[PDB]
């Protein structure tokens, strides 16, 4: 997260991390046993970490649960980034408490101008590398689809929307992928891609979770 602030400790209990040797992506806990992330965060073996604030200095109250099933959207395409969304089934249900709890699926798509909250442990610099141990937060508005498309001509599919600032300086960044964009208490986006981080006219592009609510429910039910 570039240009953000440090989230209050455990103020985002739905925020999880994907781990394989190190923290490589984020995710969102959407039910006891299921996490939403980005398909480009796919690996065959993943440890999910929940309840974290500082990823290096563990309090001892965190939950570490291996992914039992890791399912990318079947129309995910690595070159176009279309349908960049993935479900993880945890090998056991997470224990729901003040620090680990779910984020609601969206009941309407995101409206242009709606304020959202984007979070993760990604790079905090546009032109350098500073990877924070403490979870970072960013308030940012949903952009019009026209601003989105104009920023990335030919690249914005129906599965995508833009959130951020055309003036640059505030964005998600590498190591944030897979994490949440929350608007009005609902998971609207998954952190996906952008051209650099926080560059002028290159806002973050996010997978539109609303488009996948039915796929999410079908996948959960079929794997229950």
């Amino acid at each position: 997260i570039v240009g953000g602030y440090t989230c209050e400790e455990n103020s985002l209990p739905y925020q999880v991390s994907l781990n394989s040797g190190s923290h490589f992506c984020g995710g969102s806990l959407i039910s006891e046993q299921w996490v939403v992330s980005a398909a480009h965060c796919y690996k065959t073996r993943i440890q999910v970490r929940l309840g974290e604030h500082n990823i290096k200095v563990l309090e001892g109250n965190e939950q570490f649960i291996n992914a039992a099933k890791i399912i990318r959207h079947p129309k995910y395409n690595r070159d176009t980034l279309d349908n960049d969304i993935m479900l993880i089934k945890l090998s056991s249900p997470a224990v729901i408490n003040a620090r680990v709890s779910t984020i609601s699926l969206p009941t309407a798509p995101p409206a242009a101008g709606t304020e959202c909250l984007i979070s993760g442990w990604g790079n905090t610099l546009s032109f350098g590398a500073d990877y924070p141990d403490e979870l970072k937060c960013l308030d940012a508005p949903v952009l019009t689809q026209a601003e989105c498309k104009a920023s990335y001509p030919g690249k914005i599919t129906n599965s995508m929307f833009c959130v951020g600032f055309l003036e640059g300086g505030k964005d998600s960044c590498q190591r944030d992928a897979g994490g949440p964009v929350v608007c009005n208490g609902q998971l609207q986006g998954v952190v996906s891609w952008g051209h650099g981080c926080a560059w002028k006219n290159r806002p973050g592009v996010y997978t539109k979770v609303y488009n996948y609510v039915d796929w999410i429910k079908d996948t959960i039910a079929a794997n229950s």
Partner: protein, 55 residues
């Protein structure tokens, strides 16, 4: 030199941090970077040894 050894390291547009190595032409050494998980260029390797072997 293999041409790709002289490509600028490219994390690509995706926003993961997949640990990879690239050949740094200024330092003549292989260095670790966060590859975002898509696109990028061939100056990218899984291990320091592959980067050292190729470059």
């Amino acid at each position: 030199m293999h041409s790709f050894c002289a490509f600028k390291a490219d994390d690509g547009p995706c926003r993961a941090c997949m640990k990879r190595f690239f050949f740094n032409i200024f330092t003549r050494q292989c260095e670790e970077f966060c590859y975002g998980g898509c696109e990028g260029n061939q100056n990218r390797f899984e291990s320091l040894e592959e980067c050292k072997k190729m470059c």
